[PDB]
Amino acid sequence: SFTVEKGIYQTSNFRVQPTESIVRFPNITNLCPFGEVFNATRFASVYAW
Amino acid sequence: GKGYHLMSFPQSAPHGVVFLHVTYVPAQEKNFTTAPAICHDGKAHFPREGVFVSNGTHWFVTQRNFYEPQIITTDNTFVSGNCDVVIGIVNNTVYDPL
Amino acid sequence: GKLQDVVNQNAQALNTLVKQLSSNFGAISSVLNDILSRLDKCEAEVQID
Amino acid sequence: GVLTESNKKFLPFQQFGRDIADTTDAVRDPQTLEILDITPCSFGGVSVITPGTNTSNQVAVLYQDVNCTTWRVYSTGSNVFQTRAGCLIGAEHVNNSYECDIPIGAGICASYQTSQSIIAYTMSLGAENSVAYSNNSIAIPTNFTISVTTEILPVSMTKTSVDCTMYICGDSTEC
Amino acid sequence: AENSVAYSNNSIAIPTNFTISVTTEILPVSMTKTSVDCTMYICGDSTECSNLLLQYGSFCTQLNRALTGIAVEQDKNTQEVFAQVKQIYKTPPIKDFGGFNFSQILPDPSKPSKRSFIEDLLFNKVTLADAGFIKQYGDCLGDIAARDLICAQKFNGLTVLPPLLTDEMIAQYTSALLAGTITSGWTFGAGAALQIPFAMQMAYRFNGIGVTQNVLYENQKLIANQFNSAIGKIQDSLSSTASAL
Ligand SMILES: *[C@@H]1O[C@H](CO)[C@@H](O[C@@H]2O[C@H](CO)[C@@H](O)[C@H](O)[C@H]2NC(C)=O)[C@H](O)[C@H]1NC(C)=O
Ligand SMILES: *[C@@H]1O[C@H](CO)[C@@H](O[C@@H]2O[C@H](CO)[C@@H](O)[C@H](O)[C@H]2NC(C)=O)[C@H](O)[C@H]1NC(C)=O
Ligand SMILES: *[C@@H]1O[C@H](CO)[C@@H](O[C@@H]2O[C@H](CO)[C@@H](O)[C@H](O)[C@H]2NC(C)=O)[C@H](O)[C@H]1NC(C)=O
Ligand SMILES: *[C@@H]1O[C@H](CO)[C@@H](O[C@@H]2O[C@H](CO)[C@@H](O)[C@H](O)[C@H]2NC(C)=O)[C@H](O)[C@H]1NC(C)=O
Ligand SMILES: *[C@@H]1O[C@H](CO)[C@@H](O)[C@H](O)[C@H]1NC(C)=O
Ligand SMILES: *[C@@H]1O[C@H](CO)[C@@H](O)[C@H](O)[C@H]1NC(C)=O
Ligand SMILES: *[C@@H]1O[C@H](CO)[C@@H](O)[C@H](O)[C@H]1NC(C)=O
Ligand SMILES: *[C@@H]1O[C@H](CO)[C@@H](O)[C@H](O)[C@H]1NC(C)=O
Numbered sequence: 334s335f336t337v338e339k340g341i342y343q344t345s346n347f348r349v350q351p352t353e354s355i356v357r358f359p360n361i362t363n364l365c366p367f368g369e370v371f372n373a374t375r376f377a378s379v380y381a382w
Numbered sequence: 383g384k385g386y387h388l389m390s391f392p393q394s395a396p397h398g399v400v401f402l403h404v405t406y407v408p409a410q411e412k413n414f415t416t417a418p419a420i421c422h423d424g425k426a427h428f429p430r431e432g433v434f435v436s437n438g439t440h441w442f443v444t445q446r447n448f449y450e451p452q453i454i455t456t457d458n459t460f461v462s463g464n465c466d467v468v469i470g471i472v473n474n475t476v477y478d479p480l
Numbered sequence: 481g482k483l484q485d486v487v488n489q490n491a492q493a494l495n496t497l498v499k500q501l502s503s504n505f506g507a508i509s510s511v512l513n514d515i516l517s518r519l520d521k522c523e524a525e526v527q528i529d
Numbered sequence: 530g531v532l533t534e535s536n537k538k539f540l541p542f543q544q545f546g547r548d549i550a551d552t553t554d555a556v557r558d559p560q561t562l563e564i565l566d567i568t569p570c571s572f573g574g575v576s577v578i579t580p581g582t583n584t585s586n587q588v589a590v591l592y593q594d595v596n597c598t599t600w601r602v603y604s605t606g607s608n609v610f611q612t613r614a615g616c617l618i619g620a621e622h623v624n625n626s627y628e629c630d631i632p633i634g635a636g637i638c639a640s641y642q643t644s645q646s647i648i649a650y651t652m653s654l655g656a657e658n659s660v661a662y663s664n665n666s667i668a669i670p671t672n673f674t675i676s677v678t679t680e681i682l683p684v685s686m687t688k689t690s691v692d693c694t695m696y697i698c699g700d701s702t703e704c
Numbered sequence: 705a706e707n708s709v710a711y712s713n714n715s716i717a718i719p720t721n722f723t724i725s726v727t728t729e730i731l732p733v734s735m736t737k738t739s740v741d742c743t744m745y746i747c748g749d750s751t752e753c754s755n756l757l758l759q760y761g762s763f764c765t766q767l768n769r770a771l772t773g774i775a776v777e778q779d780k781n782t783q784e785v786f787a788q789v790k791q792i793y794k795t796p797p798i799k800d801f802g803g804f805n806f807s808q809i810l811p812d813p814s815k816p817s818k819r820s821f822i823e824d825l826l827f828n829k830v831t832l833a834d835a836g837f838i839k840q841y842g843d844c845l846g847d848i849a850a851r852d853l854i855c856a857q858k859f860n861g862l863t864v865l866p867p868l869l870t871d872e873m874i875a876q877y878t879s880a881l882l883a884g885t886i887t888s889g890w891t892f893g894a895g896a897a898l899q900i901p902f903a904m905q906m907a908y909r910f911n912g913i914g915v916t917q918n919v920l921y922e923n924q925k926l927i928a929n930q931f932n933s934a935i936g937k938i939q940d941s942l943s944s945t946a947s948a949l
């Protein structure tokens with residue numbers, strides 16, 4: 334409504350906005366063995382995977 | 383309603399009822415000096431209904447909720463025991479019809 | 481006001497019931513006709529559920 | 530959320546901690562091996578005290594659970610008074626005691642009085658008068674008044690009926 | 705306990721004495737006023753969740769309307785129970801009520817609050833969950849080690865609003881009721897308070913229960929002693945057990 338009668342009204346609790354964003358990942362730099370997994374000269378049989 | 387209830391009147395309102403409570407509210411209080419009983423001939427007198435009051439000199443017996451003083455008389459009070467055990471008892475004469 | 485409260489409470493309850501028909505409740509839409517017109521009988525049953 | 534230093538001791542095979550609500554409390558920081566406690570940054574109730582919007586557009590904000598004696602308040606401005614119910618911002622404290630108009634709480638009420646402004650005050654329980662009690666004094670009424678008081682009581686409410694098929698499935702056979 | 709009662713058509717048992725018995729009855733009047741925030745409970749801090757919740761605004765308005773009604777109801781309950789009289793009577797400085805002792809059930813001026821002795825015992829015998837209504841953000845941030853339940857409630861949007869009348873003010877109302885009752889009897893309820901000596905008030909009360917008012921006067925000291933002993937018994941009882949409240 335555009336009109337509010339006399340009284341006291343509960344509103345949403347006090348909000349604090351995030352001031353900045355951070356990202357924390359483990360300290361590692363090696364690339365995963367994509368070549369050894371996908372570029373493998375010899376794949377295994379399905380029964381012995 | 384506030385005060386002693388005399389009688390109520392009902393009225394209908396939408397989805398409800400309205401009671402007009404006519405009640406009796408005492409209005410004009412006045413101070414008096416009083417005692418629980420009076421010693422007449424060594425025997426204490428207590429009101430059968432009422433209370434002893436005094437306007438300074440004389441002692442009357444009056445009803446509880448309205449100042450209607452009456453002369454102290456045997457038909458206004460009743461006797462029980464001597465006039466020493468009672469605390470706050472006073473001295474006064476108890477009239478008798480003659 | 482004690483009786484006007486009763487009248488207003490009943491009227492507001494019914495109006496709230498009418499207003500609450502605009503919720504999706506997880507469905508793709510809050511309107512039966514929209515669901516039945518864009519979806520076949522197959523998943524229209526899931527949404528109408 | 531807010532990250533703070535934690536005294537929790539995680540086992541070597543643990544990375545997160547959790548409430549009874551299973552929301553994440555503590556996290557082992559992956560770079561430096563320390564435990565950080567996570568907390569929400571939204572906290573504390575807020576109430577708005579207003580007269581009618583046609584009466585005025587001013588409002589006083591009661592921030593419960595904040596001490597105003599920087600702050601977790603939208604705006605300080607002026608007239609910052611620490612009530613027992615919270616921190617009232619936008620209302621002028623007065624030393625008088627009136628009847629309650631807008632109950633703030635904790636024995637504090639607010640009203641809109643005169644330059645018009647919102648005032649806050651401790652309510653008045655009533656007129657303070659004693660009685661001249663004595664062991665040999667009685668007050669007796671010499672007159673009376675007949676008072677007619679009104680008492681309103683609700684007796685019934687509107688009888689309602691509901692059709693499921695027409696509310697849930699209005700004019701839809703498949704529904 | 706089985707107890708057969710002797711009966712006959714020409715036999716009657718008449719009392720020859722009496723006891724003034726003071727009993728305690730406890731009644732809840734209000735409960736905690738509570739408020740709920742859908743956004744902060746259902747959707748902790750995510751904006752996506754609040755955007756999704758935007759279509760249930762009617763449901764949340766319904767919930768908060770019901771809770772606000774409950775809160776106003778609690779305030780009205782306390783007001784109607786305790787604000788019977790809007791005249792704050794105060795007891796006279798001299799306490800001469802014909803041997804009756806009201807020290808335990810009257811305000812103590814030598815305490816920060818004006819609660820009586822019995823009121824102090826009662827307030828000490830109930831452990832309030834909140835014990836206050838100011839829980840600052842710093843305090844909840846500084847006790848992450850201790851799993852405080854109030855902080856967990858308040859971080860999910862569940863707040864407890866303070867009651868309108870504080871305990872000191874309800875104590876003031878009760879003290880006014882005591883003062884009016886002992887200084888004027890029932891008259892202060894039925895309009896303006898009319899003073900009457902307490903012995904004569906008790907005489908009226910005795911006449912009310914169908915025994916002549918004299919027996920009080922011939923037994924005023926005994927009745928006062930019995931009342932004092934009963935009050936002391938209540939005081940001792942409330943200070944020993946925990947199931948009373
Ligand atoms: C009512 O009258 C009797 C008359 O005897 C009073 O009794 C005397 O009171 C005086 C003062 O206390 C004593 O010195 C006498 O010894 C009493 N005489 C007897 C026979 O009792 C009595 O005091 C009067 N009551 C009041 C309240 O004054
Ligand atoms: C008791 O109170 C009533 C009114 O409350 C008094 O009646 C009034 O008396 C004055 C005296 O001239 C009149 O002018 C008024 O018109 C009366 N009012 C009504 C409604 O009738 C009455 O006099 C009082 N009686 C005593 C003994 O004090
Ligand atoms: C009515 O009961 C009370 C006891 O509750 C009696 O008062 C006791 O009387 C004896 C007499 O020796 C005293 O030893 C006690 O100290 C009294 N107790 C109290 C609290 O006063 C009283 O006597 C009985 N009434 C009658 C007529 O026998
Ligand atoms: C009424 O009962 C109390 C019991 O506590 C009597 O004793 C007093 O108690 C109060 C507690 O509020 C103390 O402050 C006083 O020091 C106590 N006085 C004494 C002599 O013990 C009290 O005396 C009784 N009232 C009367 C008039 O005797
Ligand atoms: C690299 O990893 C180690 C341990 O994981 C950590 O101590 C160090 O801070 C990391 N380097 C940087 C620049 O953060
Ligand atoms: C995979 O094999 C092809 C052909 O030798 C080569 O061009 C490509 O660079 C290889 N990719 C990776 C990730 O090793
Ligand atoms: C009765 O006495 C007291 C004290 O003198 C006084 O305040 C009061 O006004 C008196 N009552 C009336 C009706 O005048
Ligand atoms: C008390 O009342 C009586 C009779 O009405 C009268 O004779 C006497 O003068 C009055 N005394 C006082 C002090 O009013």
Ligand SMILES: *[C@@H]1O[C@H](CO)[C@@H](O)[C@H](O)[C@H]1NC(C)=O
Nearest residue numbers: 469470471663664665798800
């Ligand atoms: C009433 O009080 C006064 C002073 O307090 C005293 O002189 C008088 O003796 C008392 N009367 C009775 C019956 O106790």
Ligand SMILES: *[C@@H]1O[C@H](CO)[C@@H](O)[C@H](O)[C@H]1NC(C)=O
Nearest residue numbers: 336337338339581582583584
């Ligand atoms: C608000 O105040 C104006 C007068 O200034 C009046 O016309 C109007 O009816 C009022 N509206 C409400 C809801 O009180």
Ligand SMILES: *[C@@H]1O[C@H](CO)[C@@H](O)[C@H](O)[C@H]1NC(C)=O
Nearest residue numbers: 595596597598611612613838
């Ligand atoms: C915090 O609020 C309470 C409420 O009375 C107050 O006593 C206290 O002084 C406030 N804290 C400080 C440092 O003033």
Ligand SMILES: *[C@@H]1O[C@H](CO)[C@@H](O)[C@H](O)[C@H]1NC(C)=O
Nearest residue numbers: 621622623624625626648649
């Ligand atoms: C209110 O009363 C207190 C204590 O007497 C005083 O410090 C203060 O200045 C007063 N404020 C106003 C506006 O009267």
